[PDB]
């Protein structure tokens, strides 16, 4: 089995937090190549893309800050 | 059945947009049936402006949460 | 040859842009064949709008997928 640290633990916590966000974005892109002017399609596109953007930014910032605490506390060993 | 906060906001707008989109067609076909009056043209114009302004409100109410949450992420450290 | 996660996203819309170029070129040609109707002018605005919408949507896709990980690589440390 692949390993997972606390950083990987929180990253996986976000990844399992969003159920089908990646697939939803991909299918929004796929349908946006066919019927783009559709309101119920284009609005959902932009909404879910913004949600995906914030999800990725939250993942990166959370893992970076947790690495920051880890580095700061580990610097105090010596 | 996922619907995040941005999707939650869009939910309050999709049901309004659908009604306007269904009634603008009912205005257009009526106008095509009897275009001899200007009152029906004004009604169709008002319905179209209704649809487009509500759509624009939906368009802007999402980019205004975009930067709020982005600024939260910037100070999220 | 090589194609990253942005090249394929751009090419996803390329299947419709070529179609719409062909269609708009035929629209101009048939307008030149006979211009005495507003139906063709209306179709012209219907099609140029779809063109601008495809192009702007593709630009938005590539921009947002640039910014999705520009920030992640900014704090890549």
């Amino acid at each position: 089995t692949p390993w997972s640290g606390y950083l990987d633990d929180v990253s996986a916590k976000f990844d399992t937090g969003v159920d089908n966000l990646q697939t939803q974005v991909t299918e929004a892109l796929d349908k946006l190549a066919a019927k783009p002017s559709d309101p119920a399609l284009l609005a959902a596109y932009q909404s879910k893309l913004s949600e995906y953007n914030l999800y990725r930014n939250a993942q990166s910032n959370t893992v970076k800050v947790f690495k920051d605490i880890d580095a700061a506390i580990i610097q105090n060993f010596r | 059945p996922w619907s995040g906060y941005l999707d939650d906001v869009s939910a309050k707008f999709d049901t309004g947009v659908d009604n306007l989109q269904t009634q603008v067609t009912e205005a257009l076909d009526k106008l095509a049936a009897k275009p001899s009056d200007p009152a029906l043209l004004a009604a169709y114009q008002s319905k179209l402006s209704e649809y487009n302004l509500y759509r624009n409100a939906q368009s802007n109410t999402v980019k205004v949460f975009k930067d709020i949450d982005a600024a939260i992420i910037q100070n999220f450290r | 040859p090589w194609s990253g996660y942005l090249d394929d996203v751009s090419a996803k819309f390329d299947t419709g842009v070529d179609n719409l170029q062909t269609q708009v070129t035929e629209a101009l040609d048939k307008l030149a064949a006979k211009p005495s109707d507003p139906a063709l002018l209306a179709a012209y605005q219907s099609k140029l709008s779809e063109y601008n919408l495809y192009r702007n949507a593709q630009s938005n896709t590539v921009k947002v997928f640039k910014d999705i990980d520009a920030a992640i690589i900014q704090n890549f440390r």
């Binding site: 002017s37 559709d38 | 603008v24 257009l28 095509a32 | 507003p38 139906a39 219907s46």
Partner: peptide, 19 residues
């Protein structure tokens, strides 16, 4: 329920009254 078809109906009804 989409917008390409409403553009199509506009481009069609602008001619449906021409003749």
């Amino acid at each position: 329920i989409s917008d390409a078809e409403i553009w199509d109906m506009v481009s069609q009804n602008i001619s449906a009254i021409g003749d």
